[PDB]
Amino acid sequence: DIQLTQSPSSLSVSVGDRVTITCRASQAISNSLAWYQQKPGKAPKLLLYAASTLESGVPSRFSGSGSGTDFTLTISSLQPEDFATYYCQHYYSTPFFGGGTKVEIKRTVAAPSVFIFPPSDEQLKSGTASVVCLLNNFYPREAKVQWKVDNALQSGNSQESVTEQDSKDSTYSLSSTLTLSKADYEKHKVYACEVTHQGLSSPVTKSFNRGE
Amino acid sequence: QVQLQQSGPGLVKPSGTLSLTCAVSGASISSGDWWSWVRQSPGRGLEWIGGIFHSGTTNYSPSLKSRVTMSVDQPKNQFSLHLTSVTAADTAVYYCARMRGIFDYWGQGTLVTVSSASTKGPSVFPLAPSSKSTSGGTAALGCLVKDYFPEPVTVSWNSGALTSGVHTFPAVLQSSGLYSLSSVVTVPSSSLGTQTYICNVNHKPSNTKVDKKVEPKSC
Amino acid sequence: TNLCPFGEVFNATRFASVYAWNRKRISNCVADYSVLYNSASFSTFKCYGVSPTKLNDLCFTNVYADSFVIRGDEVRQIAPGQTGKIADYNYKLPDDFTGCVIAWNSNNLDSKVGGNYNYLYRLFRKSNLKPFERDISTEIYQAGSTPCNGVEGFNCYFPLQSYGFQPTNGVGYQPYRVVVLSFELLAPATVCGPK
Ligand SMILES: *[C@@H]1O[C@H](CO[C@@H]2O[C@@H](C)[C@@H](O)[C@@H](O)[C@@H]2O)[C@@H](O[C@@H]2O[C@H](CO)[C@@H](O)[C@H](O)[C@H]2NC(C)=O)[C@H](O)[C@H]1NC(C)=O
Ligand SMILES: [Cl-]
């Protein structure tokens, strides 16, 4: 079968920068080549086909070129909402999708704003206690969270989740959830999440005290 | 625009059969188009599964042919995918699409989880704000949507009126094998005791529809 | 001797599909552009190489009025230097275009409750259209390596696709009727403004 590969597989560029993505075919495919944009949580959206023909309604900053084996997608000026994975696909024979090029947005450092949430009374009535630590609107993505319970470091009882890059300000947010049984929760008093991030001079701690 | 509406259960036990149906509006099935399915799983990217012409002619990915059947129903203006003897490797978001060389219109996708685990609806807990603090400050509140299976749940705030500053986190699988996720929003600290905040949680696999009021907590 | 017949172009009950866009040659008449420039019906009245109001005070050898239906988000394609499927495969204006693009929303006339509809566009072509060229062929499009030989199949596509005009569509997807007036100075002027 005729296959396609994309280069680079991921890039990080600033708002307003020119973006060049390459699609190479293992054999000549004339101009039977299309490009798609896929935003998180959504279906791919057709941008271009026949190598250079824009689909109706597609913004003018997108264009394509190429014939045979070498094809190029261009974003002339990246906007923040252009965070997405870009795919090429040929229809010269059996349809085949390239591996995708993940476009991330580079911006200035932003330290996280940290919030901590105690378990609700309803949840404690049900037999468990979850403590939620929120790191809001930071950049870059790299962040470390550590939990301490009664000044004792925890391991094995916390889970982390990160949003995708925000479509408007290009920041991330992160949740770290510490979950204990009600019996274990009631044995301790201090629940602290310690946050390490590039925008801070030193790690920042927020904590909750059971029964205060 | 052409609308492709997908239906069919997202949870399938290993060795079971995945069955999905796509309802087409704004276009007729009787066209020179190939009514197609494409799936997406981490690492695999987008993978064309196959397509079916309104005449019944089919074109399937050779790696999947033995397990794939598609069909069309012109009077209902719909088409279907059936994938037998599913394994964990078939877990993916499945999309239907109108194809004629290009895939110009796509369904919303259906997350398909191949798993032996049973369906469970979530518990919804308030994440209370605690900075009823100084005015001009910004408070954070949310909802913890805990212990459900499979994905997905959806979260809205104030039946959709509140969108700005909302973060709904990706679901994570807990040590128990059940999913949990939080949805948070930052609001002005001033409006806390006056403004009402309600998270609307829906877990269709369990027919769970919950509304939770999130109000400040005090002594 | 007589006024140019813009009424039968702009007020026609039926409009052409864009792939089969209609052309009306305007000749040997006095053109009263006032009915058009001073109309409130048009959402687009975009003129190239001429101020819309000095038209009634200029003469032209030959005037053409081209008419068709497209989607609202495609009206911007009816302009020089565009690169979308409409400009490439359906209706192409030249770089040196002199004339006006006039369009108005026609949702109340050209959409119906069901989707499946009669307005079509060309999806594929071996090459882009030259300016003012028209392609009404229905040859099977060879997207792959083997000739289709008139047979539809995988990688061998019927080249025309229908617009799906439904009344509930968003404005960018609603039908728009478009008239393109193009004015050429080639020969003796037979179409003149009333001034
Ligand atoms: C296209 O037709 C409109 C509407 O014409 C009116 O309805 C017809 C069915 C018929 O009854 C006519 O007598 C009407 O005028 C034209 O718009 C009108 O134009 C006249 C100019 O003579 C003006 O006085 C009216 O106010 C206009 N009415 C509206 C609603 O715009 C229009 O001029 C015609 N287009 C062309 C190019 O001639
Ligand atoms: Cl011409």
Author numbering:
A (entry chain F): 1 to 212
B (entry chain E): 1 to 219
C (entry chain B): 333 to 518, 520 to 528
What does the paper say about this structure?
The spike glycoprotein is the major target for neutralizing antibodies, which makes it a key candidate for both vaccine development and immunotherapy. The most potent antibodies tend to target the receptor-binding domain (RBD) of spike and interfere with the binding of RBD with the human ACE2 receptor. We characterized B-cell-derived anti-SARS-CoV-2 RBD antibody repertoires from vaccinated and infected individuals and elucidate the mechanism of action of broadly neutralizing antibodies and dissect antibodies at the epitope level. The Fab-RBD crystal and Fab-Spike complex structures corroborate the epitope grouping of antibodies and reveal the detailed binding mode of broadly neutralizing antibodies.
A more convincing case was found in JM-1A, another antibody identified in this study, with its RBD-complexed structure solved at 1.9 Å. As a Class 1/2 antibody, JM-1A shares a somewhat similar binding mode with several other antibodies which recognize both the inner and outer sides of the RBD ridge. Compared to the most similar one Omi-25, JM-1A has a longer HCDR1 and approaches RBD even further by tilting down its LCDR2 for more contacts and bringing the N-terminus of VH to the interface. The extensive JM-1A/RBD interface involves the epitopic loops 403–408, 415–421 (α4 helix), 455–456, 473–477, 484–490, and 501–505 (α6 helix) that are majorly recognized by HCDR1, HCDR3, and LCDR2. Q1 at the VH N-terminus (cyclised as a pyroglutamate, PCA) stacks with the aromatic side chain of Y505 and forms hydrogen bond with N501 which is further connected with G496 and Q498 coordinated by a water molecule. Moreover, the uncommonly employed LCDR2 is engaged with the 415–421 helix and 455–456 loop of RBD. Mutations of Q493R, Q498R and N501Y in BA.1 variant may explain some of its decreased neutralization potency, but its significant drop in the activity against BA.4/5 and BQ.1.1 is probably due to the only residue difference in that area, F486V, which may affect the surrounding interactions, including W34 (HCDR1), N59 (HCDR2), M99 (HCDR3), and P95 (LCDR3). Another key residue in the paratope of JM-1A is G32 on HCDR1, and the G32F substitution was found to increase RBD binding in all the tested subvariants. In the WT RBD, E484 interacts with the backbone carbonyl group of G32 via a water molecule, but when it is mutated to A484 in Omicron variants, there opens a gap in this interface. The G32F mutant is predicted to fill this gap and also extend the original four-ring aromatic stacking to involve two more rings, F32 (JM-1A) and F490 (RBD), each spaced at ~3-4Å, which could not be achieved by the G32I mutant.
